[PDB]
Design a protein around this nucleic acid. Sequence first.
RNA 1: GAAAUUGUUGAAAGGGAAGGGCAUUUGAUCAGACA
RNA 2: CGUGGAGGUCAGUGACGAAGCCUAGACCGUAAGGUCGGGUCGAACGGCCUCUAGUGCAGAUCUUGGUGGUAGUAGCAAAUAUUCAAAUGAGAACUUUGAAGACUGAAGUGGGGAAAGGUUCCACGUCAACAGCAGUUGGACGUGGGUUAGUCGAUCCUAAGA
RNA 3: GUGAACAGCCUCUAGUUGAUAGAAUAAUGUAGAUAAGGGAAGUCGGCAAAAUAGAUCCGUAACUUCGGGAUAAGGAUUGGC
RNA 4: GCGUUGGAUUGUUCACCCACUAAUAGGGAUACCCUACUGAU
RNA 5: UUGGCGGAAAGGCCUUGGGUGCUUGCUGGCGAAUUGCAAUGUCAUUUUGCGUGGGGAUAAAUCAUUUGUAUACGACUUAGAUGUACAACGGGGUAUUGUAAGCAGUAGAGUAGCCUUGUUGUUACGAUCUGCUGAGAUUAAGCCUUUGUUGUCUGAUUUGU
Lengths: 107, 115, 360
Amino acid sequence: DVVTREYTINLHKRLHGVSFKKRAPRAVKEIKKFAKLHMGTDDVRLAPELNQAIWKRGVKGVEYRLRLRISRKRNEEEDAKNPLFSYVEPVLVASAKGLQTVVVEED
Amino acid sequence: FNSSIGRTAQGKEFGVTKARWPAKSVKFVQGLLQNAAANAEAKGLDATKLYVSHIQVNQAPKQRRRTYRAHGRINKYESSPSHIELVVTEKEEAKVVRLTSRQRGRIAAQKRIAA
Amino acid sequence: APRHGHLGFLPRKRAASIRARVKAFPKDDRSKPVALTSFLGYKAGMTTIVRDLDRPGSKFHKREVVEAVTVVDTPPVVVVGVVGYVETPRGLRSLTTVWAEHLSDEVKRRFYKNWYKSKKKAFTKYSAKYAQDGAGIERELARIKKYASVVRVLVHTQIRKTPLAQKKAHLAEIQLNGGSISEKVDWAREHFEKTVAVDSVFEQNEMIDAIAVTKGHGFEGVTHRWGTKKLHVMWSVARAGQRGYHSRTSINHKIYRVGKGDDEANGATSFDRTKKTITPMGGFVHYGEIKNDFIMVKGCIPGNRKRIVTLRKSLYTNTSRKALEEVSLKWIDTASKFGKGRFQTPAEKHAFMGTLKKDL
RNA sequence: GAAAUUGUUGAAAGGGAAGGGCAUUUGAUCAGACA
RNA sequence: CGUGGAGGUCAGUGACGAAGCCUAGACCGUAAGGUCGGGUCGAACGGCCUCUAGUGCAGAUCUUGGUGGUAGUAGCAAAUAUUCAAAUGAGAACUUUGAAGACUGAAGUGGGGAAAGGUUCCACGUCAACAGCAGUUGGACGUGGGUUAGUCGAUCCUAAGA
RNA sequence: GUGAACAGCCUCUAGUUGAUAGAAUAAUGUAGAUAAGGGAAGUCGGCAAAAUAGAUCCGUAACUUCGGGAUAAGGAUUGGC
RNA sequence: GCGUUGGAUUGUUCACCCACUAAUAGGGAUACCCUACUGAU
RNA sequence: UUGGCGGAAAGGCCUUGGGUGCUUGCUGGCGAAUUGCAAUGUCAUUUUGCGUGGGGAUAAAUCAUUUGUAUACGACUUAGAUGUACAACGGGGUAUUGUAAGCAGUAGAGUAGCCUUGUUGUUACGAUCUGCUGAGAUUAAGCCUUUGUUGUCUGAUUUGU
């Protein structure tokens, strides 16, 4: 079931009332947990470009929203948990509004 | 060894309120269980019937380590290690009466009346 | 000095059920028809009310005065079964229950606790016992007609008919204050799988008792628990512990309205003449809408929003004038409590703001 | 390779005390003599 | 009664297992204490008449050594703050690199020196210990390498002074 | 850069990213703050907290060992183009 | 059964006023460790 | 087997019908030994199990997860197996602030300015002001609402009169 998706994720409703020095790192775990819920896989990998996108407004300045690409994939041999995992990289827009989830066609 | 423990529900299987999830002990332990399954297979034994019959654990000699604390004191600081052993075993699904004549004649009379 | 606390509600622990359990009822009167002694619904929010005042002699006689009320969702309530109770030299004794041949998914989902894994086999033998003749049923019914000096009926709510989503029904037992216990159970037997209003128990110009469980507040210590000052052992020395989620009982509660879901313009006094239900702008605060009957009662019930309560019809023949005065509403505030509400209707919002960029 | 102390198994007991004393019951266990 | 030694004695016991030890297994003696069986163990020892003493322990805020509760408890909380992928390897909250985020903010978390320290400096290999967590890393461990002077300095001068 | 400055704040050169971590927000603590209306009534006790504080214009009493007290008091002013 | 105050004055309880209110009566009784108390499975 | 009665902690007390025995109500026949003169001389009743051959019915809970009416940790309350489903986004409703970036102007004290020497000369800069603008951003993390799109919807454990 190799599949790719777009997804938004709303961080203002996930990072309310939080320690300033953990607003930004906690978003990492929230994102991985989001992949764990939607895609249904536990072993998660991210992009340093996306890490830049999160951290760019400091730690106590993280944006209220983002927009993401997700790619569930197969895995290489004997990474024993599953033949699959998830990967996460961003996609660039002047706003993440008026968007919604979509399977991106395959090329 | 169950004091000032935060309680949690996953012991409710066992009928107990207090529980905890150690890692290090378990790593060594399933090291041993893998060793014992390996050894039973080396003997050429089954594992599907196989259960742990006996485990055992007993204190062992302490590192003399230290730290330094108030009023100028070397107050000791030290370990609590473990010997461990266990024995695993294949599950297996598996007098004459002195008496007296007063008691003898009675039963013989019950036979006598038994038609 | 006084003591920085009461002593009646002294074992300040949490109750065992969010359903505050009826303990008292007014006794009986075996001359009337049957009148249900209680009812129950789900508290939703508060509002403010002005009310013209027929209070002879008071300073505020024939004046408008603002006061403050609460609101509770009060759908129709279906009966599912009965029980009898007999006097002993121990107390009372449950001696038979009887149920009503077809039971909702809601109450079947109450008695089970992990629903979807269940096979939902709750009453499958009981409905089979409801044979061609109902022989065993009539056996265990006429028994109660003979015995059981006092009798109660079981109810359950229709909670799917609320904006709330819990899917589960809150049972209760309710005592009757009619006579002729044979007539009581016959009445109830006719009411099997039949439902009951709240304007068919209550009406305006009424006093009630409100028994519920409070909001919880966790393990607050002495200074906010008992309002005590700030810098062997006795049990009244104002030591810290759990606050909130206690059971309570609040009495002498003047109803003003017995609302109706089908009645449009539930917020209409004689004065407003505006087609608005009392559900104000924004929805309720942590509760949704009021498209059912309702009650508007003054003061403030123990509870929090989207919490259950139980109602009792004042348990005795009151004596104060305030128990008998005649209510007349003049205006319901219908503004959003999600902010400093100013406007009743979104049409009024349009009217006072004008048209806007997004409007066209 | 003793003792404090510690674990596993076997047996037994246990409601704010334990241990000891006189007698006995239950259970386990046991030496001696019949020629 | 008992103990360490000594003079005699039992032509004493003793690898076919002395002594010591363990034992809700037995016998004796009122009692100190003795005797016996079994198990363990591996090389000396005891009965009797006498002798001689560093001769018998519950205690001494006793001594030395060891071990317990307290307890997997207090606590590892000052020093803004860390995050993502790859490599390594079996294993990464911590090693290395790379992308971002912060900081010391030049009377510094920089670079050099004095006194003192003395191989800590550098590489390779490596973790059983040490680094109050872990560690594949390290001032830790092993093996080695490395300090170049006519001009910097000491030596020379004399100071208060000895 | 700032500004009187070697105060404090920010930054470049250079160097650390070391201080056991993780999940949760119940009280009370420890440090730090805000609170109407009154304004030291409280309290042995204005203990502590808080008030003005920087720069310019005017002005600054008695008393004196005439040298000061004196940033006296007290009033106004303070941005950008 | 329920209630008995706000101030003024001394290191000091000795001493004694103002005003309110219904009155402003008299008396006594380090701390994690086990206990008790408040709460919780 | 018939029909009654009894709720205070009934769990038993009556009664019809026959069947089935025994009768010490009266009179007969047979047997008893030997436990050696007695040795409780074992007779009842609680519970459970394994086997017997005959009927009967073929479920919950906990954990994990999610919510939060609750919340120290536990707990209490909710939801979830193909749908009146549940969720992640998005739209709409409420409210929150207070009018965005991007530009344009015959507003804009003023000072220069290429000289078409004005007689608003126009061109430069220019705090700000005026207009697209109740605009923009935010909105449940412990708000309302949804015919939208996209996904989930069978993982571990334990329990018996």
